[PDB]
């Protein structure tokens, strides 16, 4: 749209991508973490390894 | 706009007119950068004979 293009232009004008995103400094970021499995490809009993997606 | 302390300090340290990652930190000529290293093992996963 027209409003999404202006927002994308405004959004990334000055964005340092290696400063961690907190307003204060002593505040930690909180990362909600979940993992999903698609298939279990193989578990080699000989080499003792496990391949997952 | 609004920035952090870390963003301002990051803008001050790695400045292109002042910091360059291709010349080594020698204050003078023939100065040895003493680095020190220590290996930490995690697992013997395999030994292919």
């Amino acid at each position: 749209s027209e409003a999404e293009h202006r927002l994308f232009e405004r959004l990334f004008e000055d964005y340092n991508e290696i400063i961690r995103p907190v307003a204060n400094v002593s505040d930690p970021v909180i990362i909600h973490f979940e993992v999903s499995m698609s298939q279990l490809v193989k578990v080699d009993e000989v080499n003792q390894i496990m391949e997952t997606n | 706009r609004v920035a952090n302390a870390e963003e301002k300090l990051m803008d001050d340290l790695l400045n292109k007119t002042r910091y360059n990652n291709l010349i080594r930190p020698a204050t003078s000529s023939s100065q040895l950068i003493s680095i020190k290293l220590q290996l930490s093992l995690a697992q013997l996963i395999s030994v292919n004979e």
Partner: antibody
Amino acid sequence: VQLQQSGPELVRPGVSVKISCKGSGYTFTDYALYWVRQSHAKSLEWIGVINPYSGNTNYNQKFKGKATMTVDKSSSTAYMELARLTSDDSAIYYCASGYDGYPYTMDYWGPGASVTV
Amino acid sequence: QIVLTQSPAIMSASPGEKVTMTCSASSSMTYMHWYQQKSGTSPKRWIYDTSQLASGVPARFRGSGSGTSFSLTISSMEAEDAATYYCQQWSSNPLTFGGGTKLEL
């Protein structure tokens, strides 16, 4: 949507002063509060910004050693305290609440308090 | 870091006349806002992101500009359009406003 402030106050120079700003008609969190002074020549300057949900402040570098900005999540009211009042501080003080997103503007404005020193 | 300057300071126009105001900067920017204050009361948000209009604003006005030069334009002059217009940028620390242009009849 209303912002409510205190009345005009007559304070001698050398005494700290405290004014307030209480907002209603909108959800008080998720916005941010800007403090703007205006002299008698109608040339108006910016003092500071507070976030009333966390309390993170940013002051203007001209006004760092003078103003103190607090909020209160109980009654939804911000307090601004000025110190070292001189003759060059008789002005009109506005609180203005804006959304903390990329417009970054003053969406709503208060009536304005009058400080005469 | 950036100090804005408006031109002209005091101006006037007849109802039905094109009006142009300019706001200039020390260095370059891309986005700049415009506020309207009447006599006695509080300002209002009037133009944001250098071209857009707020909610309760008639669609006659037009803001445009780039680099270090910006402008507001009135096509059809209004009877109740006597106010004071301020231009302001947040793109450089600190938040500096404009000097103010007073438009009267």
